[PDB]
């Protein structure tokens, strides 16, 4: 019952085999909440595509580890692992054992970790400039949202440069993205602090308060008593001194009058996820009752005011006296489906440089370093005696499936690409990757184009991918139990 | 009916898929399993249709399609079936778009009318015979796919010298070249550069007795005091001793084709018997030859009696010396078949560059001609052009290349020629079937006759009109 | 529930064809109607592409893609969704046999984005701006275009008289033209020549209660009260039901009930509302209150006309009479009850914010007045888009043929895989002028085959004549359409086809 596990993981790769690269195909994602989505992100497929075959889940948990400590290489987990087991079936057809093949991959993983630093050609300059971040973030824009290589390269760079001076404090949790209905990507902008699209309900312009609190005769008597009840609540807020009150629910017409009576800025936020962002930044939590005057659950902010950017009244929550490391990228888009696809490409770019906060090392992509890595591992496999030759030799051919995906997804023949990728590297022309062109099957230097991946990303992508192929091959039979 | 015509289209659609990959020099073969059980594998598409026996009335139209093309032209019959096969696939789509077959027939006949005109406006005349030579280049490309290419200009010049010395009109100022050609033989002269071209036919026989000489410069050649005697009936031992007394070089048991080639080379006529129904006469000065020199050359294990400088020969003889049996045998057929390439080009004098350039260049002119006629004839003439682009698209697969790329690079070069006649634009460009790229056929030498491309488009269009003229199905 | 590869794309290709076939015959002015029935049995007969797809509600996801793309068409242009979904699916049909030939779906996206950008550049090349051509007045040329929209209609005989009202109806508006501000009302009786144009706000006025020879209609500076309260004595919503144990108190129960209407109408006199345009009916007793108090009233009006009056006088619709003040009341110069068509009608003329108007339709049949409403509304659109966008092109399918000539002639000199893909993109653009012949009953074979022959000779503004079964110069025939419409429509079409071709697998979350 071993091949049934290989056929299970083989099918999971063929779905994301086409979503790889910039010319990859989109996916008709039907959400469980009676919603329709269209994208080409491989990470979102598995979240919705419920693969119940537990043999393939080991590859998914490896892809989930590709989200921790790194934010790229998800296709590497599914493609490289899926190609490893496809060729592993060719070995067992001859009559090889499972342990010798596992041990051969355990050795090849150590040989691959030593060749990758040799192929590190260039890296970042560590200047904290906008041209440095935008020029290198072109790799994150690839295969997540094509065509916006110019727009998002500078937009993402503007939010990270504000935090790079805070050495060792750059995080993806500090960059919260917002999206507003608009014409297109041209109306996008970048702002500091937390910016929310909802306008200010009150007529208060600016306030530097730190206290931010997030939340027939008888017929006319109780109707006016409610007006005294609401006034007593804003008076309770005035007793606390909170000039900025963030409302999670609905606001009465009389509350707008009392909010301006005591000079209290009143802001409404219907989105719960936007309210959760305030819990982790200023310290103010959302209380369920009608405005509890709890001075302990109020946050701390140096300045709060209303702004208008792109013809949209938006409230600003920045920190002038403190250091400040929060940035908000406000994108504009007419279609909510495609507008969210851009939101994911932004998170992919923020996390790419979050790993570059460590030792900055980059490797060219596009089939350049993967064949150079497969060319050197094959050299160790030819001279290394013993029965490990069949596993190490095929471990190099597993690296070939990735440029084969870049070839087929680009409409280019897969065999002609690898034949030319091996000829240029036989002559020593390193850093030569496949040129993205539907008509030109030729190749060129990717370093001259400005395509550079993360050295620290390929490490964990090759390790988690090979360890998953070991975990799936060690299990030769799946047996059900009833607790 | 709409479903009756669909069955005639799907019927003929499968006949072309059987001989689709069999066309071209790198075409795929197919098995011919007869009813007994014998399997036969062939590569040529013409014989496939001859033995392809499938019961369908719509399919037999394509069987007789090649029979008429086999007698007049005798080549390229497979490409005639593919053109008509794809035309009905598109013509049925017109009927699905509420188009009557009558309007499609008249549009196809005019698309065929202008197709012959645009071919005639892109013809080339017989040239490269005096003053200029690419016929070297025309024959050099004919032998590029073999090991003989190591010595290009050496063997390439022997092709031009062997095809030019065999000139003879013989009919009303026709001149073509006969089916008979130079006798190519092999030798073991320790090298390939020792291959020599002699402008005279050599007889592969022995001189008989050793006492007589192997050299004679006599004019009289008796073909049955002539010294060179030839007889297929056989000469007796006591009879040959009398020729030793006479001084003649007799040869007995000679083949009729070798004797007739000498009678044609020497200007003689084969004499069957001496007795003129009443007596006995040698027929002196009646059927004797006219030659200047006759000598036998020392050849390895098979001597050749070489005759040189006759009155009218139209023949030659080349000796292929080499190092090993493999080196000499492979260059025999590469030398005889590559010679047939230029032989037909120098004969049938009105030729045209082929190699996919004809059907591709015609797809541009007929496209614009559809937008000039109108009146329920545009979509018929417009789709006739798309049917012709399948021939270079088919060869794109047989050449193991991209199916869509080679056809398009070929059209863009011809389109620039129509925009303006400047020399910057590429004109008369084909496709290299051996490499899978564009290639200028005027410099490469990929020529074809005029009667091939013209009659193929007529027979393919006329047969498709017959299959589409059918509009009923009766079964008794 | 999952599937990918070549055959998965065919399911989306053949699925989009069914959506186009559902609205294939609705393109054009003489297109066929379609009938859709809801759960309540209400049958709606119409040929509007946006209303058909809004009620079909196809569960297939591929069909939902064309609906969202057409929804944007009303935002970027305003109308013409039938041309979007039809042209969006035609790209998918011609590329169907090429998907099975072994070609990748992504290669077609590089071709469509090439041809889409090439066509927009050619629209601006042939487009001609017509502002003061031959120094003919814009009011004169616009009427010549209005008669063309009403040609081959019910009022084709006296279309010269109707054209004066099409252009003048828009001239009374501000610089920003808007069709929602324009109302059209039908009046039973009268001939086609007896039609009129009202620059004010008029309503049906189905008020058939008593109160004749009273309520003086003429006012100089009246105050328009937009109420939503019923002013009937024994009103279904305003009533009283008290039970007491005293004989003399039962009289007071009718007094307190009598005070419900009396006190409510008293605030109307305190505010000074001389004209009351109410949604709910007004009883017979309240009609006499406005008569004795020197006021006018009129109920039984839909909510559509109250909003036209809200933005016309500059007031605001209020629910009750308590908040009735000058801040929500209206104002006009001339107000008078007319007897057009024998029925009584009211209209407010001379308001400061008179950004609306009303068209009175007359005729001996209700079905004739409905078709003229859409024919007249169609003539306003040609006059509307001609004013806002002065750069127009040869409409009526003339421009689709020039694009087919440019993109095809350009693709011929383009080596690579883009010749059959842009060539098929050009062959797909010929379907709009092919289907308008079918949607008008003409033989599309003789027109399209003869239409393409003129463009090869140099015809750039020759297209399909909806009236006669022949070819004519659509630019000289006042058959104009803007450039941005054809530009914004073609890009949305390729945006729909490229989004469908980019999708290769269908995924369904089991839940
Ligand atoms: N235009 C391109 N040129 C060269 N390589 C590319 C291009 N687009 C994508 N790639 C390759 O595709 C890989 C995957 O990119 P990305 O989508 O960011 O990660 P993931 O596939 O895990 O989401 C990268 O390693 C990169 O080398």
Q: Is A3 labelled as part of a ligand binding site? A: no
Q: Is A247 labelled as part of a ligand binding site? A: no
Looking at the structure, tell me whether residues A366 and A476 fall in a common domain: yes
| Domain harbouring A159, CATH code | 3.30.260.10
Mutational test site, ligand 1, from A365, A409, A453, A460, max ligand atoms within 8 Å of CB: A365
Longest dimension (CA), chain B: 93
What number does CATH give the domain C133-199+386-392? Answer: 3.30.260.10
Count structural domains, chain A: 3
Residue owning the nearest CA to atom 5 of ligand 1: A366
Question: Measured between CB atoms, which of A27, A32, A409 is closest to C505?
Answer: A27
- Answer whether C449 sits within 8 Å of B377, measured CB to CB: yes
Helix axes A98-115, A455-474, angle to 10 degrees: 180
Chain C within 8 Å of B18 (Cβ-Cβ)? no
Question: Measured between CB atoms, which of C414, C415, C445 is closest to B99?
Answer: C445
Task: Specify the length of chain A in residues.
Answer: 483
Q: Checking DSSP bridges between strand C347-349 and strand C462-464, what pairing results, if any?
A: unpaired
- Name the strand (E) or helix (H) holding A241: none
For residue C104, which residues of chain A lie inside 8 Å, CB to CB? 408-411, 438
The residue from B302, B337, B402, B471 that is catalytic is: B337
Of the CA atoms within 13 Å of residue C432, those in its CB half-sphere come to 29
In DSSP terms, A36 is beta-bridged to: A30
- Answer whether C417 sits within 8 Å of A439, measured CB to CB: yes
Closest by CA position to C368, among listed C186, C183, C179, C182: C186
Q: Is A299:A286 a contact under the CB 8 Å cutoff?
A: no
Closest by CA position to A373, among listed A123, A85, A119: A119
Looking at the structure, tell me whether residues A212 and A97 fall in a common domain: no
Chain C contacts to A (CB-CB under 8 A): 2, 4, 61-62, 64-65, 68, 72, 75, 103-107, 110, 416-418, 499, 502-511
Structure tokens at A457: 């990303």
Alpha-carbon distances, residue A458 vs A9, A84, A369, A400, A425 (angstroms): 21, 16, 10, 15, 20
In DSSP terms, B196 is beta-bridged to: B319
- Name the 3-class secondary structure at C120: helix
Residue owning the nearest CA to atom 17 of ligand 1: A143
Question: Measured between CB atoms, which of C413, C449, C450 is closest to B415?
Answer: C413
Q: Which atom of ligand 1 is nearest to the CA of A348?
A: 18
Mutational test site, ligand 1, from A142, A355, A404, max ligand atoms within 8 Å of CB: A142
Residue with tokens 């398009």: B408
Domain boundary among A324, A345, A371: A324
C108: closest CA of chain A, how far (Å): 10
Question: Measured between CB atoms, which of B372, B408, B415 is closest to C453?
Answer: B372
Fold designation for C202-385: GroEL (3.50.7)
Q: How many CB atoms lie within 10 A of CB A195?
A: 23
DSSP state of B274: S
Is B337 among the residues known to form the active site? yes
Residues sharing a CB contact under 8 Å with residue C85, sequence separation 6 or more, in sequence order: C19, C20, C23, C49, C53, C66, C69, C70, C496
Q: Is A71 in the pocket of ligand 1 (CB under 6 A)?
A: no
- Answer whether C415 sits within 8 Å of B364, measured CB to CB: no
**φ, ψ of residue A27 in degrees (nearest 5):** -130, 135
- Enumerate the known binding-site residues of B for ATP: 24, 76-78
Looking at the structure, tell me whether residues A242 and A334 fall in a common domain: no
Chain C within 8 Å of A350 (Cβ-Cβ)? no
Q: Is B192:B323 a contact under the CB 8 Å cutoff?
A: yes
Looking at the structure, tell me whether residues A209 and A289 fall in a common domain: yes
Cα separation of A145 and A156, whole Å? 14
B68: closest CA of chain C, how far (Å): 32
Residues sharing a CB contact under 8 Å with residue A358, sequence separation 6 or more, in sequence order: A456
Looking at the structure, tell me whether residues A345 and A461 fall in a common domain: no
What's the angle, vertex CA C286, arms to CA C281 and CA C292, rounded to 5? 140
- Answer whether B99 sits within 8 Å of C101, measured CB to CB: no
Chain C within 8 Å of B364 (Cβ-Cβ)? yes
**Rounded distance from Cα A468 to ligand 1 centre (Å):** 21
Q: Is A285 in the pocket of ligand 1 (CB under 6 A)?
A: no
Q: Is A462 in the pocket of ligand 1 (CB under 6 A)?
A: no
Structure tokens at C468: 């006669």
In the PDB record, what is the listed experimental method? cryo-EM
Chain C within 8 Å of A219 (Cβ-Cβ)? no
E strands within B327-404? 351-353
Q: Dihedral through CA A301, CA A303, CA A308, CA A314, nearest 10?
A: 20
For residue C414, which residues of chain B lie inside 8 Å, CB to CB? 408, 412
Q: Is C407:C426 a contact under the CB 8 Å cutoff?
A: yes
The residue from C168, C194, C238, C378 that is catalytic is: C378
Cα separation of B434 and B143, whole Å? 11
In DSSP terms, C46 is beta-bridged to: C34
In DSSP terms, B319 is beta-bridged to: B185, B196
DSSP symbols for C426-439: HHHTTHHHHHHHHH
Longest dimension (CA), chain A: 102
Q: Which atom of ligand 1 is nearest to the CA of A19?
A: 21
Mutation pick from C100, C445, C446 vs chain B, by most beta carbons of B within 10 Å, is: C445
Structure tokens at C243: 């039970």
Residue A281 domain boundaries: 193-324
Structure tokens at A309: 């950017």
- Answer whether C453 sits within 8 Å of B409, measured CB to CB: no
**φ, ψ of residue A187 in degrees (nearest 5):** -85, 10
Looking at the structure, tell me whether residues A117 and A144 fall in a common domain: no
Chain C within 8 Å of B17 (Cβ-Cβ)? no
What's the angle, vertex CA B408, arms to CA B87 and CA B134, rounded to 5? 100
Question: Measured between CB atoms, which of A28, A31, A411 is closest to C505?
Answer: A28
- Answer whether C412 sits within 8 Å of B411, measured CB to CB: yes
- Answer whether A28 sits within 8 Å of C506, measured CB to CB: yes
Mutation pick from B388, B393, B401, B412 vs chain C, by most beta carbons of C within 10 Å, is: B412
Q: Is A352 in the pocket of ligand 1 (CB under 6 A)?
A: no
- Name the 3-class secondary structure at A89: helix
Question: Measured between CB atoms, which of A15, A48, A439 is closest to C4?
Answer: A15
Residue with tokens 């029965």: A387
- Name the 3-class secondary structure at B430: strand
What is the gyration radius of the CA atoms in chain B, in angstroms?
28
Q: What's the sign of the alpha-carbon dihedral A410, A411, A413, A414?
A: positive
Cα separation of A208 and A328, whole Å? 20
Q: Dihedral through CA C91, CA C96, CA C97, CA C100, nearest 10?
A: 140
- Answer whether C507 sits within 8 Å of A30, measured CB to CB: yes
**Rounded distance from Cα A117 to ligand 1 centre (Å):** 19
- Answer whether C102 sits within 8 Å of B403, measured CB to CB: yes
For residue C64, which residues of chain A lie inside 8 Å, CB to CB? 36
Cα separation of B464 and C210, whole Å? 83
- Answer whether C417 sits within 8 Å of A438, measured CB to CB: yes
Residues sharing a CB contact under 8 Å with residue C374, sequence separation 6 or more, in sequence order: none
B410: closest CA of chain C, how far (Å): 8
Helix axes C81-94, C483-502, angle to 10 degrees: 40
- Data resolution in angstroms: 4.1
| Domain harbouring A438, CATH code | 1.10.560.10
Q: Is A74 in the pocket of ligand 1 (CB under 6 A)?
A: yes
Q: Which long-range contacts (CB under 8 A, 24 or more apart) does A56-64 make?
A: A56/A8, A56/A9, A56/A11, A56/A12, A56/A472, A58/A468, A58/A471, A58/A472, A59/A9, A59/A12, A59/A468, A59/A472, A60/A12, A61/A468, A62/A464, A62/A465, A62/A467, A62/A468, A63/A464
Domain boundary among A307, A333, A360: A360
Cα separation of C392 and C482, whole Å? 4
What is the gyration radius of the CA atoms in chain C, in angstroms?
29
Burial A282-298 (b: 16+ CB within 10 A, else e): bebbbeeeebbbeeebb
Q: Is A428 labelled as part of a ligand binding site? A: no
Domain boundary among A324, A342, A377: A324
Cα separation of B244 and B190, whole Å? 36
Q: Is B394:B356 a contact under the CB 8 Å cutoff?
A: no
Looking at the structure, tell me whether residues A145 and A290 fall in a common domain: no
The stretches of C344-418 forming alpha helices (DSSP H) are 366-388, 398-412
Alpha-carbon distances, residue B205 vs B259, B294, B299, C31, C162 (angstroms): 11, 13, 11, 91, 109
Is B44 among the residues known to form the active site? yes
Cα separation of B460 and B85, whole Å? 8
Q: Is B306:B314 a contact under the CB 8 Å cutoff?
A: no
């Amino acid at each position: 019952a071993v091949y049934r596990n290989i056929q299970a993981c083989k099918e999971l790769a063929q779905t994301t085999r086409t979503a790889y690269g910039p010319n990859g195909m989109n996916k008709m994602v039907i959400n469980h909440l009676e919603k329709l989505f269209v994208t080409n992100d491989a990470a979102t497929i598995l979240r919705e595509l419920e693969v119940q075959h537990p043999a393939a889940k080991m590859i998914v948990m490896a892809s989930h580890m590709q989200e921790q400590e790194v934010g790229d290489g998800t296709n590497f987990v599914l493609v490289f692992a899926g190609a490893l087991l496809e060729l592993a079936e060719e070995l067992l057809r001859i009559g090889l054992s499972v342990s010798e093949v596992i041990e051969g991959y355990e050795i090849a993983c150590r040989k691959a970790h030593e060749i990758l630093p040799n192929l590190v050609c260039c890296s970042a300059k560590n200047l904290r400039d906008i041209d440095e971040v935008s020029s290198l973030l072109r790799t994150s824009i690839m295969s997540k949202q094509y065509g916006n290589e110019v727009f998002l390269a500078k937009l993402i760079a503007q939010a990270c440069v504000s935090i790079f001076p805070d050495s060792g404090h750059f995080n993806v949790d500090n960059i919260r993205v917002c999206k507003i209905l608009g014409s297109g990507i041209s109306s996008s902008s970048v702002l500091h602090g937390m910016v929310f699209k909802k306008e200010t309900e009150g007529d208060v312009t600016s306030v530097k308060d730190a206290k931010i609190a997030v939340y027939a005769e008888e017929l006319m008597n109780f109707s006016k008593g409610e007006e005294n009840l609401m006034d007593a609540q804003v008076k309770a807020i005035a007793d606390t001194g909170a000039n900025v009150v963030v409302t999670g629910g609905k606001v009465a017409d009389m509350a707008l009058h009392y909010a301006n009576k005591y000079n209290i800025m009143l802001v409404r936020l219907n989105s719960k996820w936007d309210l959760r962002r305030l819990c982790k930044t200023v310290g103010a939590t959302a209380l369920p009752r009608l405005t509890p005057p709890v001075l302990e659950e109020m946050g701390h902010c140096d300045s709060v005011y209303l702004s208008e950017v792109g013809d949209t009244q938006v409230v600003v929550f920045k920190h002038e006296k403190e250091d400040g490391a929060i940035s908000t990228i406000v994108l504009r888009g007419s279609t909510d489906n495609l507008m969210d696809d851009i939101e994911r490409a932004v998170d992919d770019g923020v996390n790419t440089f979050k790993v570059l906060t460590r030792d900055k090392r980059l490797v060219p992509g596009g089939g350049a370093t993967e064949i150079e890595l497969a060319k050197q591992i094959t050299s160790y496999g030819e001279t290394c005696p013993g029965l490990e030759q069949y596993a190490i030799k095929k471990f190099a051919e597993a690296f070939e499936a990735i440029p084969r995906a870049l070839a087929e997804n680009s409409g280019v023949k897969a065999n002609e690409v690898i034949s030319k990728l091996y000829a240029v590297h036989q002559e020593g022309n390193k850093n030569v990757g496949l040129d993205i062109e539907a008509e030109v099957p030729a190749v060129k230097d990717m370093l001259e184009a400005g395509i550079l991946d993360t050295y620290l990303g390929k490490y964990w992508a090759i390790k988690l991918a090979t360890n998953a192929a070991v975990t799936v091959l060690r299990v030769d039979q799946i047996i059900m139990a009833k607790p | 009916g709409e479903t009756i015509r669909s069955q005639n289209v799907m019927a003929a659609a499968s006949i072309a898929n059987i001989v689709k990959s069999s066309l071209g020099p790198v075409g795929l073969d197919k098995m011919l399993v007869d009813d007994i059980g014998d399997v036969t594998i062939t590569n040529d598409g013409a014989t496939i249709l001859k033995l392809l026996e499938v019961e369908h009335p719509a399919a037999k139209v394509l069987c007789e399609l090649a029979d008429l093309q086999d007698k007049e032209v005798g080549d390229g019959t497979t490409s005639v079936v593919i053109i008509a096969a794809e035309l009905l696939k598109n013509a049925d789509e017109l009927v699905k778009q509420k188009i009557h077959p009558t309007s499609v027939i008249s549009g196809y006949r005019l698309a065929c009318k202008e197709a012959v005109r645009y071919i005639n406006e892109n013809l080339i005349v017989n040239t490269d015979e005096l003053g200029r030579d690419c016929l070297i280049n025309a024959a050099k490309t004919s032998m590029s796919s073999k090991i003989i290419g190591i010595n290009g200009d050496f063997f390439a010049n022997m092709v031009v010298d062997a095809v030019l010395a065999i000139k003879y009109t013989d009919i009303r100022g026709q001149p073509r070249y006969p089916v008979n050609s130079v006798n190519i033989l092999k030798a073991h002269g320790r090298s390939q550069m020792e291959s020599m071209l002699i402008s005279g036919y050599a007889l592969n026989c022995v001189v008989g007795s050793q006492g007589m000489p192997k050299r004679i410069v006599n004019a009289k050649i008796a073909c049955l005091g002539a010294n060179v005697i030839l007889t297929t009936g056989g000469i007796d031992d006591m009879c040959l001793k009398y020729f030793v007394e006479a001084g003649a070089m007799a040869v007995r048991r000679v083949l009729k084709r070798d004797l007739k080639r000498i009678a044609k080379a020497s200007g003689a006529t084969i004499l069957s018997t001496l007795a003129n129904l009443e007596g006995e006469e040698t027929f002196e000065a009646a059927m004797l030859g006219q030659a200047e020199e006759v000598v036998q050359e020392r050849i390895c294990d098979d001597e050749l009696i070489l005759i040189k400088n006759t009155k009218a020969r139209t023949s030659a003889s080349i000796i292929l010396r080499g190092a090993n049996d493999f080196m000499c045998d492979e260059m025999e057929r590469s030398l005889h078949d590559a010679l047939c390439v230029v032989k037909r080009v120098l004969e049938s004098k009105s030729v045209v560059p082929g190699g996919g350039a004809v059907e591709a260049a015609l797809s541009i002119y007929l496209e614009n001609y559809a937008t000039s006629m109108g009146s329920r004839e545009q979509l018929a003439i417009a789709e006739f052009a798309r049917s012709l682009l399948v021939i270079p698209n088919t060869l794109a697969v047989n050449a193991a290349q991209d199916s869509t790329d080679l056809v398009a690079k070929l059209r863009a070069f011809h389109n620039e020629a129509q925009v303006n006649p400047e020399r910057k634009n590429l004109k008369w460009i084909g496709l290299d079937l051996s490499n899978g790229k564009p290639r200028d056929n005027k410099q490469a030498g990929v020529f074809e006759p005029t009667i091939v491309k013209v009659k193929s488009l007529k027979f393919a269009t006329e047969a498709a009109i017959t299959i589409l003229r059918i509009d009923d199905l009766i079964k008794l | 529930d999952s599937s990918q590869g070549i055959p998965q794309l065919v399911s989306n290709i053949s699925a989009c064809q069914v959506i186009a076939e559902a609205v294939r015959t609705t393109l054009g002015p003489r297109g066929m109607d379609k009938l859709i029935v809801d759960g309540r049995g209400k049958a709606t007969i119409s040929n509007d592409g946006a209303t058909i797809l809004k009620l079909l509600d196809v569960v297939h996801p591929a069909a939902k893609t064309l609906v969202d793309i057409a929804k944007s068409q009303d935002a970027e242009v305003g109308d013409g969704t039938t041309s979007v979904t039809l042209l969006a699916a035609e790209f998918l049909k011609q590329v169907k046999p090429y998907v099975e030939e072994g070609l990748h779906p992504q290669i077609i996206i590089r071709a469509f984005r090439t041809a889409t950008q090439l066509a927009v550049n050619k629209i601006k090349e042939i487009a001609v701006t017509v502002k003061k051509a031959d120094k003919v007045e814009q009011r004169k040329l616009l009427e010549k275009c209005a008669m063309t929209a009403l040609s081959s209609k019910l009022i084709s005989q006296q279309k010269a008289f109707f054209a004066k009202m099409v252009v003048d109806a828009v001239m009374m508006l501000d610089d920003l033209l808007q069709l929602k501000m324009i109302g059209i009302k039908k009046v039973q009786g009268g001939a086609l020549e007896d039609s009129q144009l009202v620059a004010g706000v008029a309503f049906k006025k189905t008020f058939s209660y008593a109160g004749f020879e009273m309520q003086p209609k003429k006012y100089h500076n009246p105050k328009i009260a937009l109420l939503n309260v019923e002013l009937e004595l024994k009103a279904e919503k305003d009533n009283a039901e008290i039970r007491v144990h005293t004989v003399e108190d039962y009289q007071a129960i009718v007094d307190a009930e009598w005070n419900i209407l009396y006190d409510k109408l008293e605030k109307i006199h305190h505010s000074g509302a001389k004209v009351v345009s109410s949604k709910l009916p007004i009883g017979d007793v309240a009609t006499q209150y406005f008569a004795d108090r020197d006021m006018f009233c009129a109920g039984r009006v839909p909510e559509e006309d109250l909003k036209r009056t809200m933005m016309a006088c500059g007031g605001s619709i209020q629910t009750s009479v308590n908040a009735l003040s000058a801040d929500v009341l209206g104002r006009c110069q001339v107000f008078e009850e007319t007897q057009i068509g024998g029925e009584r009608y009211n209209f407010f003329t001379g308001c400061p914010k008179a950004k609306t108007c009303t068209f009175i339709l007359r005729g001996g049949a209700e079905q004739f007045m409905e078709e003229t409403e859409r024919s007249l509304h169609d003539a306003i659109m040609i006059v509307r888009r001609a004013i806002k966008n002065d750069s127009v092109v040869a409409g009526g399918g003339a421009i689709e043929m020039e694009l087919s000539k440019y993109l095809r002639d350009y693709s011929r000199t383009i080596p690579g895989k883009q010749q059959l893909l842009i060539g098929a993109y050009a062959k797909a653009l010929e379907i709009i002028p092919r289907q308008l012949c079918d949607n008008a009953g003409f033989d599309a074979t003789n027109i399209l085959n003869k239409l393409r022959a003129r463009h090869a000779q140099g015809g750039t503004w020759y297209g399909v004549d909806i009236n006669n079964e022949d070819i004519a110069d659509n630019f000289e025939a006042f058959v104009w359409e803007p450039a941005m419409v054809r530009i914004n429509a073609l890009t949305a079409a390729s945006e729909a086809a490229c989004l469908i071709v980019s999708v290769d697998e269908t995924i369904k979350n089991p839940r």
